[PDB]
Enzyme design. Structure first.
Site, PDB file in Angstrom:
ATOM      1  N   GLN A  21       0.824  -1.223   0.000  1.00 38.20           N
ATOM      2  CA  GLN A  21       0.000   0.000   0.000  1.00 38.20           C
ATOM      3  C   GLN A  21       0.853   1.266   0.000  1.00 38.20           C
ATOM      4  OE1 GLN A  21      -1.286  -0.914   4.360  1.00 38.20           O
ATOM      5  NE2 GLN A  21      -1.385   1.272   4.163  1.00 38.20           N
ATOM      6  N   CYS A  27      -5.149   0.903   4.235  1.00 38.25           N
ATOM      7  CA  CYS A  27      -5.269  -0.499   4.675  1.00 38.25           C
ATOM      8  C   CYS A  27      -6.708  -0.993   4.669  1.00 38.25           C
ATOM      9  CB  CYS A  27      -4.649  -0.685   6.041  1.00 38.25           C
ATOM     10  SG  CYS A  27      -5.544   0.107   7.402  1.00 38.25           S
ATOM     11  N   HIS A 157      -4.948  -0.909  12.030  1.00 35.27           N
ATOM     12  CA  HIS A 157      -4.471  -1.472  10.775  1.00 35.27           C
ATOM     13  C   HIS A 157      -5.328  -2.659  10.371  1.00 35.27           C
ATOM     14  CE1 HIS A 157      -1.604  -2.077   7.568  1.00 35.27           C
ATOM     15  NE2 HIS A 157      -1.243  -3.286   7.998  1.00 35.27           N
ATOM     16  N   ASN A 177      -0.647  -9.189   5.097  1.00 35.42           N
ATOM     17  CA  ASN A 177      -0.428  -7.747   5.264  1.00 35.42           C
ATOM     18  C   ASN A 177      -0.202  -7.153   3.892  1.00 35.42           C
ATOM     19  OD1 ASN A 177      -0.068  -5.272   6.572  1.00 35.42           O
ATOM     20  ND2 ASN A 177       1.776  -5.893   7.690  1.00 35.42           N
TER      21      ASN A 177
HETATM   22  C1  LIG Z   1      -4.773   1.651   7.886  1.00 35.06           C
HETATM   23  C2  LIG Z   1      -3.408   1.662   7.272  1.00 35.06           C
HETATM   24  O1  LIG Z   1      -3.253   2.169   6.121  1.00 35.06           O
HETATM   25  O2  LIG Z   1      -2.399   1.138   7.819  1.00 35.06           O
HETATM   26  C3  LIG Z   1      -5.508   2.969   7.473  1.00 35.06           C
HETATM   27  O3  LIG Z   1      -4.920   4.040   8.214  1.00 35.06           O
HETATM   28  C4  LIG Z   1      -6.958   2.807   7.841  1.00 35.06           C
HETATM   29  O4  LIG Z   1      -7.800   2.525   7.042  1.00 35.06           O
HETATM   30  N1  LIG Z   1      -7.345   2.955   9.226  1.00 35.06           N
HETATM   31  C5  LIG Z   1      -8.703   2.771   9.651  1.00 35.06           C
HETATM   32  C6  LIG Z   1      -8.731   1.726  10.799  1.00 35.06           C
HETATM   33  C7  LIG Z   1      -8.171   0.388  10.330  1.00 35.06           C
HETATM   34  C8  LIG Z   1      -9.007  -0.112   9.151  1.00 35.06           C
HETATM   35  C9  LIG Z   1      -8.347  -0.576  11.526  1.00 35.06           C
HETATM   36  C10 LIG Z   1      -9.233   4.110  10.124  1.00 35.06           C
HETATM   37  O5  LIG Z   1      -8.533   5.048  10.287  1.00 35.06           O
HETATM   38  N2  LIG Z   1     -10.616   4.250  10.367  1.00 35.06           N
HETATM   39  C11 LIG Z   1     -11.146   5.518  10.850  1.00 35.06           C
HETATM   40  C12 LIG Z   1     -11.893   6.216   9.731  1.00 35.06           C
HETATM   41  C13 LIG Z   1     -12.726   7.339  10.344  1.00 35.06           C
HETATM   42  C14 LIG Z   1     -13.818   6.733  11.220  1.00 35.06           C
HETATM   43  N3  LIG Z   1     -14.354   7.677  12.183  1.00 35.06           N
HETATM   44  C15 LIG Z   1     -14.693   7.187  13.510  1.00 35.06           C
HETATM   45  N4  LIG Z   1     -15.154   7.975  14.354  1.00 35.06           N
HETATM   46  N5  LIG Z   1     -14.527   5.980  13.809  1.00 35.06           N
END
Ligand SMILES: *[C@@H](C(=O)O)[C@H](O)C(=O)N[C@@H](CC(C)C)C(=O)NCCCCNC(N)=[NH2+]
Length: 214
Positions: A21, A27, A157, A177
């Site tokens: 990525q 992710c 992640h 991964n």
């Molecule tokens: C993961 C990566 O590239 O390593 C990438 O940062 C990502 O998609 N992170 C997600 C969480 C992972 C899928 C566990 C993420 O940041 N989600 C949050 C999006 C915004 C959601 N808003 C609230 N309040 N939850």
């Protein structure tokens, strides 16, 4: 449900080669897409690499390289579908949503009850599962073996369970991964399974989801 002691969907030809990525926080898209790619093959389709770039660019419920949700990608693939990587290659930056031929749609997705590694095992015996884990320094620096290091403090992640097994009586999950083939065991990490904490190793069992077709 009768569950085999070990499963490796790579041996069944259901995983495309490992991807990278890059610096983009996509992710969520890699985790959703690998599960859809594998399910298409498992159900009798041809193994095809599918476009995380299309998810980054088109899934406006998520935030492109600034993060997102596997479930937002599943919802989009249900309604609008997903193109191949060949037609919509990954560049690791968000651009406009480009129109491309659709390979497939899915029908929906399901979750697994949280914090139940034996339930995750039942689904993992049938298909690839999307999961989200708490990555910190020890996970970043993983090279080989069954990981049992410390964890990050937040679920941050998205990865995939592609099977499970045991080595010298120590059970593990096989986790795909998106950090290229030079990380870990050719891009994969084996993580300790059936831990005392029911959330699983760095939270593998906290939020599993998987696509469905038909
Ligand atoms: C993961 C990566 O590239 O390593 C990438 O940062 C990502 O998609 N992170 C997600 C969480 C992972 C899928 C566990 C993420 O940041 N989600 C949050 C999006 C915004 C959601 N808003 C609230 N309040 N939850």
């Amino acid at each position: 449900f009768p569950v085999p002691p070990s499963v490796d969907w790579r041996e069944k030809g259901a995983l495309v080669p490992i991807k990278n990525q890059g610096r983009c926080g996509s992710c969520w898209a890699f985790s959703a897409v690998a599960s859809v790619e594998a399910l298409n093959k498992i159900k009798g389709g041809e193994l095809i690499s599918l476009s995380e770039q299309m998810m980054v660019d088109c899934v406006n419920a998520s935030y492109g390289c600034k993060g997102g949700r596997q479930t937002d990608a599943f919802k989009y693939i249900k309604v609008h579908g997903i193109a191949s990587s060949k037609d919509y290659p990954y560049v690791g930056v968000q651009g406009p949503c480009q129109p491309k031929e659709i390979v497939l749609k899915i029908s929906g997705y399901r979750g697994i009850v949280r914090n139940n590694e034996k339930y995750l095992q039942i689904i993992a015996s049938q298909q690839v599962v999307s999961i989200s884990i708490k990555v910190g320094k020890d996970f970043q620096h993983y090279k080989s073996g069954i990981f049992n290091g410390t964890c990050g403090d937040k679920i941050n992640h998205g990865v995939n369970v592609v099977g499970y097994g045991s080595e010298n009586g120590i059970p593990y999950w096989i986790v795909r991964n998106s950090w290229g083939k030079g990380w870990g065991e050719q891009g994969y990490i084996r993580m300790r399974r059936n831990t005392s904490n029911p959330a699983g190793c760095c939270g593998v069992a906290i939020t599993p989801t998987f696509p469905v077709i038909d």
